[PDB]
Structures are given as structure tokens and as C-alpha cells.
């Protein structure tokens, strides 16, 4: 799947057997991207 770096606006798509680090950055803090399947909210 795809991930996103922490301290820069990037969009990594490196799956397994890759992980760290980032593309044109150097830091190893990677967050996972939001799901495609939309979640509803009872606006209450």
C-alpha cells in the first residue's frame, strides 16, 4: 500500500521489504494514509 512522511508533504507507496526511510528527506517517521472506504458520522 502507500504511506506518507511526517515532516514533509510526500506520498510514498513503498510496500513491504522497503519501509524506512523517505524519498528526498532522510527521516524515518512514516504515517499510514487514510482509508478509501468512507466512514459515516451521525452528526450528533
Amino acid at each position: 500500500l502507500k504511506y506518507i512522511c511526517a515532516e514533509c508533504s510526500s506520498k510514498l507507496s513503498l510496500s513491504r521489504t522497503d519501509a524506512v526511510r523517505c524519498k528526498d528527506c532522510g527521516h524515518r517517521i512514516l504515517l499510514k494514509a487514510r482509508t478509501k472506504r468512507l466512514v459515516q458520522f451521525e452528526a450528533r
Partner: protein, 137 residues
């Protein structure tokens, strides 16, 4: 509202009186051994992994992690990890279940290598708690 108890206006509660965000972080890590034995993060199938959890794994991705945004509740599996110890059932389950009493939404998943080069993960789940009968003020 007797004996140090209070009555709270439900209408104001609806408008957001004393509402709160509650975040919770779960932390997991892939273990390492001398003979290059390593645990892996994945979504295990019931035919290839021992023990397993009673909860479902259907919310896990290929990397054995939930995508932030997905609603989780009950004993759902948040982190999917296996540990190996031909032959059927070659893996032991080491997956992490969402808190049995708690529920909420996966707020943010963090994947990072350790100082010893160990791929470890912190999953943060968010839950909005609304003031209820029995809440301490």
C-alpha cells in the same frame, strides 16, 4: 442529585457540553533472534497460523495494519503480527486486539524502524466520549 451526585442538562450535552476526545496508543514491535529469526507484520490466514484471535482480521491490510479512518470496536484486530517457531501451521499468532471494553476510530497509524533496526508500530485510536450518567465531575 442527592449524596454528592448531580443532574446535567441533556440538551446542553447535545450541544457539546463537557464532550471529550480520547486517544489511545497501542505499540507493537517485530522481535529479533540470533539466527536471523524475525517476526513479521502481516494479515494471517486461519489455515497458516496457530492459536489466532476470536476477533476478525478483515480490517487489516497487507501490511498487517488498519488504515486510519476505519471504525473499530469489540475485540477487533488492530495489529497483525506472526511469530514462526514442510509442515502445516508454521506460524504462531502475536496479533494485537482492540480493547475489549473500548471502541472508536483508528485516528493515526505510525510505522517506524527502531534504534536496533526493528520495524515497530504505534496505532492511535480516537473515541469521542459524551457525558453520561455516572461520569465524575
Amino acid at each position: 442529585n442527592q449524596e454528592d451526585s448531580m443532574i446535567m442538562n441533556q440538551s446542553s450535552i447535545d450541544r457539546g457540553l463537557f464532550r471529550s476526545l480520547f486517544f489511545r496508543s497501542y505499540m507493537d514491535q517485530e522481535k529479533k533472534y540470533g539466527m536471523s529469526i524475525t517476526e513479521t507484520f502481516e494479515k494471517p490466514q486461519r489455515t497458516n497460523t496457530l492459536r489466532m484471535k476470536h476477533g476478525t482480521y478483515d480490517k487489516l491490510d497487507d501490511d498487517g495494519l488498519i488504515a486510519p479512518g476505519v471504525r473499530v470496536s469489540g475485540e477487533d484486530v488492530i495489529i497483525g503480527k506472526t511469530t514462526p517457531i514442510t509442515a502445516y501451521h508454521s506460524k504462531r499468532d502475536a496479533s494485537t486486539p482492540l480493547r475489549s471494553t473500548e471502541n472508536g476510530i483508528v485516528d493515526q497509524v505510525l510505522v517506524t524502524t527502531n534504534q536496533d533496526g526493528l520495524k515497530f508500530v504505534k496505532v492511535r485510536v480516537r473515541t469521542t466520549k459524551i457525558p453520561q450518567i455516572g461520569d465524575k465531575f
